[PDB]
Amino acid sequence: SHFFADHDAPLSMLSVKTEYFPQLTDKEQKYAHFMSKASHAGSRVVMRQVSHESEPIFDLILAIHSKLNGKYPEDDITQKQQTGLYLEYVSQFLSNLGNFKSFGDTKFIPRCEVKFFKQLLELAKINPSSSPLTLSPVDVNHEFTSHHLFSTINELIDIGIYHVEEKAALLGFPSQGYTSAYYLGLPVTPEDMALLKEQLFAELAILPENTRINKVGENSFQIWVASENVKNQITETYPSGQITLSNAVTKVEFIFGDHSREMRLVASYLKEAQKFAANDTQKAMLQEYINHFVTGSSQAHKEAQKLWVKDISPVIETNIGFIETYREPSGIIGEFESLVAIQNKERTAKFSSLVNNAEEFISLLPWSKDYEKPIFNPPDFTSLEVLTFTGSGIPAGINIPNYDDVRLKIGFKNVSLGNILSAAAKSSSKHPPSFISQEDRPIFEKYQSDSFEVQVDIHELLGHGSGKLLTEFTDGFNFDKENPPLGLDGKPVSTYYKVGETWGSKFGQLAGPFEECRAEVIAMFLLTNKKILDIFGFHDVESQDKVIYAGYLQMARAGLLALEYWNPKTGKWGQPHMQARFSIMKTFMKHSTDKNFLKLEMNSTNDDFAIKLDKSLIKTAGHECVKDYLKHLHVYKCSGDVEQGSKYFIDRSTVTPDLASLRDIVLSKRLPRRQFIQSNSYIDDNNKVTLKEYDETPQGMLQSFLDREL
C-alpha cells in the first residue's frame, strides 16, 4: 500500500440549492443556516483530533493561497502538473479535515515534489524558518494547539506533511510508536487510558468524550475539556485543580478551555438557530448543546441527546458534538462532528402516498395471502438530504446517540443520508460511468438517480415491510397447521418457525443478504407498476419506460460492481447488499426466458466491457425472471424452508467462472474515495438565506473552505 493522496478523486458537490432547499419555509432555512454555521465552526476541532500537524497544515494552506492571491505556478507544463498534484492533496486533506484519512486511519502525503512544495513558500514569500504559530488566527489559544511541536514551517513540511514511518503513519497508542492527536506530551500508554477510564472517569461519573489527554508526567495527567469557559464553572461535577486517584500516586487535573475559540463560535451560532427552532423540544435541545460547549459539561450533551430522540421526524435534522469514539486508541474519547440534514418534503409526501396505498401493492406481489400479514405494518424509515456535515468523513447513514443508557431507556435514531447513498451508486467522476455503453449513457445519466430513489423507497417500505412467517407460538400457530399453505410446487409446506425461532436464527448469516435481496427484488417488481410511477411523479409512458430501463440497467451494473466485494480465494461475500445485487444481475443474465436479455460485450483487449440490456424485453423476460426470483425467495423465507431456501439463494449468488473472470476488470475501474463539497449559506440584503455552491474540483473544495474563514 502507498501513502500518497488520491489522484483523480471524484468530487461531489452536495447540492440542495436547486430542488430541496427551496421547499423549506423561511424559518426552516434560517434554522438550517445557523446550525450549518455552528457545524463549520468546529472544522478546526476535527483537525486537532486527527493529527498534531493537521491544523498547522491547514493554516499553511490558507497562508500560501492568500499570499499567492490564488495564483499557483503554471509556467512550464511541469508546474501545471505539480500545482494540480498539490491541489489534489489539499482537496483530500479538506475532505478528511486532516492528513490521516478517515477511511483507514492512515497518513497520506502529497504527490507533488517536496522541492515544489517549498517553492510555493518562496513564491508566497513565506520564511520557512519562521514558526507555524505565526500562521494561526491571532485569537486561537495556542496553549491547546500543536503548532509548537514544529519549530519551523520547513519542519512542518518535512515531518508533518511528508515524513512517513510505517507505525507513525497509523493512528494508535504513541507508546507503541503510533500517532494520536487525542494525546499530548509524554507518550500515552494503553495502561494509562485503562487507569483513567476506571479510576477517574468511571470513578467520578464523568463522560470522557469531549476531552483530550496531556501527559505532563509519568504519573501526572491533564484532562483538557472542550469548552468556551477557561475556568471550571461546574465544580459540582468536575473536581477543582489537581487531585490524586485511589492509588495515591496518579495525579489528574481537569483543564477547561480546549478549543475555546471554536466552542465560543459554535455556541454563538446554536444560540442564533434557537430563535428559529420548530418546537420547544428543539429549543431545549439547543440550550443543552450550548451548555455543553460553553461549560464543558459532558452530561449536558447527554441531556441534549435525550431531548433529541424525542424530536420526531423533523424537517431539519441535526446532531453535534464529540460523537464517535473509534479513532481514539482506547476508544472512549469522541471525535467532533456536526450534521445538518433536510427532508425532501416532496419525497416525504410521495412516501406518505405510497403508505396510504400500501395494501393495494402488497396484494399485487407474486404470492398467496397465506404468506402475508392480514394488516400492513409500515416499517420505520428516514431518508434525508445532507446540507452540511462537518467531520472527518460523511457516513451514508447515522445511528445515534451512542449512549447505551439513552438508547435503551429513551430510544435512538436511525437515519439514511440520501444524497450520500445516491453518490455511491451514481459513480460520478470526470467522465462516463463504468460498463455503460455509449448508447445508454444519455438515458442512464438522466434517470439513474430517479430510479434509484424509487427503488430505495419501495425496498424499504413494501420490500422489508411485506411478508408473514409461518410461526408457532406457545399456544397456537399463525397459520392453518392442519392444512398448511401450498409451496411453490403446489403441495402443503411442512416447514415453519418453531417457538423461539426467528428469521435470523433459522437462516443464520445468510438471512442478511437473502432478505436484502428479497426487498430489492420487490422494488424491481413494483418498479413497472403504473400507479407506483404516478405516485413517484412519472405520469407519461415515455418517462416511465426510461425510469424502468434505467432501473434494470443500474441493477445490472450494481451486480457487476459487487464483484469487488467477493473474495475469489474463499468465495465469501464481504457485504450483504453486494451479494444480493449480484444475485439479481446474475438472474437477469442466466435465468431469464431469453438469453439475450442481458449480455456483456467485451472489448478487443478483454480489459473492459459494455452492458447490453434489451429494453424491449423488460416487460416480458425481465419482469418474469424478477417475479420468478421473488416468488421463490418469499415462499422459502415465509415457510421457513431453510434447506431449499439456502441452496437456492447460495446458488443464485454463486460467482460462475465467466463472471469471476470479470472481477479484475471491475477492480481496475474502481473510482478513488469520493470527496464531498459542502455549500455555504449566508443571509442577503433581503434577509434571505442564500446557498453558495462550488465547482467539483480541487479549487472548488478549497474555495468552499476559504469562504468559511472570513
Q: For residue 186, how many C-alpha atoms fall within 13 Å in the half-sphere facing its CB?
A: 10
Residue 510 interaction partner, one of Zn ion, Mg ion, none, beta carbon < 5-8 Å per kind: none
Q: Does residue 519 bind Zn ion (CB under 5 A)?
A: yes
In the complex, what is the shortest distance from the CB of residue 577 to Zn ion, in angstroms, rounded to a whole number? 7
Active-site positions? 460
CA distances from residue 294 to 232, 304, 388 in whole angstroms, order as listed: 11, 14, 22
Locate 560 and state its grid cell. 457487476
Exposure letters 633-659 (e unless 16+ CB within 10 A, then b): bbbbbbbbbbeebbebbeebbebeeeb
Residue 519 interaction partner, one of Zn ion, Mg ion, none, beta carbon < 5-8 Å per kind: Zn ion
- Residue 181 or 519 having the CB closest to Zn ion: 519
- Residue 361 or 514 having the CB closest to Mg ion: 361
- Residue 105 or 516 having the CB closest to Zn ion: 516
Task: Return the residues of window 474-503 that contact Mg ion according to CB under 5 A.
Answer: 487
Residue 365 interaction partner, one of Zn ion, Mg ion, none, beta carbon < 5-8 Å per kind: Mg ion
Q: Of the candidates 237, 242, 236, which has an alpha carbon nearest to the alpha carbon of residue 254? A: 242
Q: Of the candidates 505, 436, 502, which has an alpha carbon nearest to the alpha carbon of residue 469? A: 502
- Residue 442 or 492 having the CB closest to Mg ion: 492
Which sign, positive or negative, has the C-alpha torsion 168, 170, 176, 182? Answer: positive
In the complex, what is the shortest distance from the CB of residue 700 to Zn ion, in angstroms, rounded to a whole number? 34
Q: Is 459 annotated as a binding residue?
A: yes
Among all residues, whose Cβ is closest to Mg ion? 487
Q: Does residue 206 bind Zn ion (CB under 5 A)?
A: no
Q: Does residue 365 bind Mg ion (CB under 5 A)?
A: yes
Q: Does residue 642 bind Mg ion (CB under 5 A)?
A: no
> Which residues touch 121 (CB under 8 Å, ≥6 apart)?
64, 127, 128, 153
Q: How far apart (Å, rounded) are the C-alpha atoms in residues 344 and 20? A: 6
Residue 487 interaction partner, one of Zn ion, Mg ion, none, beta carbon < 5-8 Å per kind: Mg ion
In the complex, what is the shortest distance from the CB of residue 623 to Mg ion, in angstroms, rounded to a whole number? 15
β-strands 183-185, 211-217: how paired? parallel
CB atoms within 10 A of CB 615: 17
Which sign, positive or negative, has the C-alpha torsion 427, 107, 139, 239? Answer: positive
CB atoms within 10 A of CB 325: 16
- Residue 487 or 700 having the CB closest to Mg ion: 487
Q: Is 53 annotated as a binding residue?
A: no
- Placement of cell 510555493 in the chain: 120
Q: Does residue 522 bind Mg ion (CB under 5 A)?
A: no
Q: Between vectors from CA 397 to CA 630 and to CA 401, what angle results, nearest 5°?
A: 125
CA distances from residue 558 to 139, 159, 663, 696 in whole angstroms, order as listed: 50, 42, 13, 24
Q: Do 475 and 531 touch, CB atoms closer than 8 A?
A: no
**Chain-centre distance for alpha carbon 184:** 29
Q: Is 52 annotated as a binding residue?
A: no
Binding segment for Mg ion among 51-59, 128-136, 365-373, 608-616 (CB under 5 A)? 365-373
β-strands 413-417, 476-477: how paired? unpaired
Task: Return the residues of window 164-193 that contact Mg ion according to CB under 5 A.
Answer: none
Q: How far apart (Å, rounded) are the C-alpha atoms in residues 496 and 233? A: 62
Locate 80 and state its grid cell. 501545471
Cα end-to-end distance, the chain, whole Å: 38
In the complex, what is the shortest distance from the CB of residue 640 to Mg ion, in angstroms, rounded to a whole number? 11
In the complex, what is the shortest distance from the CB of residue 576 to Zn ion, in angstroms, rounded to a whole number? 9
Binding segment for Zn ion among 176-184, 293-301, 516-524, 588-596 (CB under 5 A)? 516-524
Task: Return the residues of window 436-475 that contact Mg ion according to CB under 5 A.
Answer: none
In the complex, what is the shortest distance from the CB of residue 456 to Zn ion, in angstroms, rounded to a whole number? 9
In the complex, what is the shortest distance from the CB of residue 138 to Zn ion, in angstroms, rounded to a whole number? 51
- Residue 378 or 487 having the CB closest to Mg ion: 487
- Residue 519 or 535 having the CB closest to Zn ion: 519
Binding segment for Zn ion among 65-73, 503-511, 518-526, 701-709 (CB under 5 A)? 518-526
Q: Output the known binding site.
A: 459, 464, 516
Which residue ranges make up the site for Zn ion (CB under 5 A)?
A: 516, 519
Which residue ranges make up the site for Mg ion (CB under 5 A)?
A: 365, 487
Q: Output the known binding site for Zn(2+).
A: 459, 464, 516
